[PDB]
């Protein structure tokens, strides 16, 4: 009994801790199907049920790199009644409205420059190139966004994508997103990747992971054991809209059901890696932890390299 | 008296080379500047010995807009009263931070890329800068398709370009830029490709390559015997900027030289070809031209196919 368990970087005792375990579940923001929003696109879908479940999945990793942006790792909804304004921000730009830069509707209309009809189910590669696009319209937050290729990351890469020259005649660096994309197995997910895959979700930085089948995604946020934690998005629920007092309810933002698991080896091999880096020191702080857990492995599940690989 | 291919169009080299010369000058032309805002406040406040490829990627996307607003036949000095297209197109380009398409903008989109300003960059990178900038471009809503692995994708495209009714009345196609990236040699072109290079220029939707050596990148226009035909941005020129009634001096963006030439063994053999679809159509004949021209050859410079490849 009383296990070990990771979420996003954080640790909690299994039965010692349980309501501090299932109050950090809570506490990160939830976005499921939605149902009778404006029909995407004029006449396009009102509802993303039965095919949005890799966009909330998307949706639920870029909002938990926005959260901890701006609120920080440890920030909860329900430790204090006066909320900072950042967090009504973060919400409302997943709103189900076109005018939200996050919104289904800009995630679907940015899917189709990636060759995706409207409507169209589509992996965690894809929807890291829509974060990733997506990300130029928001001023505000002004994040860099790398998504790996080939398995691998590069330092150079990401070090020129977020230093950030000065405005007078000090280099500033953008809070980076951190996306992976990897295949870990033909059919079913290589044993040989499991400790590595499970040591990610141990990194402070961890934004968890984009996976599962077609039209049966899930956003993964830790491990106990082989079992692996998520929040689900297949619920569909009523679009809800600001008030008029600018604010819009969170209730149906998070999710205080019973925490989901599966087993690690039942996931689809196809999956997408999440890490969120504030400052330059949080990245080198991660290049020591995968340069520590994850290429120590003779099998290793990605790279990392300091110069930008040179082609022939 | 040869016959001489412009970006579609044909020319006969002895008794028509007025015209020729005319069709060439005629093409907005963008070199090298000096004396502009320094880009990101401290950057480079000019991109001579560096911004080559950007001037190339915006001689392209401007031969582009002007043929999707006025056409290809049409040029600056057949009439007094300009269309209000032209100087709009124009102003695209000028050297501001304000300007969709300017140096500054096409510089720090490259380094969403991992590339910092004031790096040369080749003709794949280029080409996501130019798909990421239209995304910002309300006036064109152009699509923007960039071929990876030499291979075109028809139902991609069709994907991409068409647009849903707006209301409840018929789907749209959005014009679009056809960018396809080619590696056709190790260290120069291989001779097997020299043909279908030259058929590309022959079709009306030619908007010609983008090619060169590091720092020396040129924007191949057409072809006459064995030779390539170019525009040369390494001429450092002054910033141009508005007059008070709001146009701008446009005699430095014309090209009033004898045509600039090189053999095509010569060329490097990264390249990017470029195509303009306006409607469906011109993309429907496109795809025939290249099923005749380019896909005839036992090895082809590159592949169209109709289903998305499958993946493993």
């Known amino acids: 009994t009383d296990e070990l368990v990771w979420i996003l970087g954080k640790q909690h005792l299994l039965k010692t801790e349980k309501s501090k375990l299932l109050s950090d579940i809570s506490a990160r923001l939830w976005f499921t199907y939605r149902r009778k929003f404006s029909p995407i696109g004029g006449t396009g879908p009102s509802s993303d049920a039965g095919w949005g479940c890799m966009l909330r999945c998307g949706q639920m990793m870029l909002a938990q790199a926005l959260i901890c942006r701006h609120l920080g790792r440890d920030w909860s909804w329900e430790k204090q009644k006066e909320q900072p304004k950042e967090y009504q921000r973060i919400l409302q730009c997943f709103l189900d409205r076109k005018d939200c830069c996050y919104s289904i509707h800009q995630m679907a209309q940015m899917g189709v420059g990636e060759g995706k009809s409207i409507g169209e189910w589509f992996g965690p590669n894809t929807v890291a190139q829509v974060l990733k696009k997506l990300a130029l319209f928001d001023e505000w937050n002004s994040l860099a966004v790398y998504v790996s290729m080939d398995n691998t990351v590069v330092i150079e890469d990401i070090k020129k994508m977020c230093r950030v020259l000065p405005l007078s005649a000090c280099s500033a660096w953008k809070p980076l997103l951190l996306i992976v994309p990897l295949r870990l197995g033909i059919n079913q997910i290589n044993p040989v990747y499991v400790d590595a895959f499970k040591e990610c979700f141990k990194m402070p930085q ?107």
């Open 206 to 312: 961890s934004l968890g992971a984009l996976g599962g089948k077609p039209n049966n995604a899930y956003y993964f946020i830790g491990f106990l054991g082989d079992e692996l934690i998520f929040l689900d998005p297949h619920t569909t629920q009523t679009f809800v809209d600001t008030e008029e007092n600018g604010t819009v309810n969170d209730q149906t933002f998070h999710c205080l059901q019973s925490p989901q698991r599966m087993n690690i080896l039942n996931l689809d091999p196809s999956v997408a890696l999440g890490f969120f880096c504030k400052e330059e020191k949080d990245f080198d702080n991660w290049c020591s932890l995968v340069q520590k857990e994850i290429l120590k492995e003779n099998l290793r599940m990605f790279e990392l390299v300091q110069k930008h690989p040179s082609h022939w």
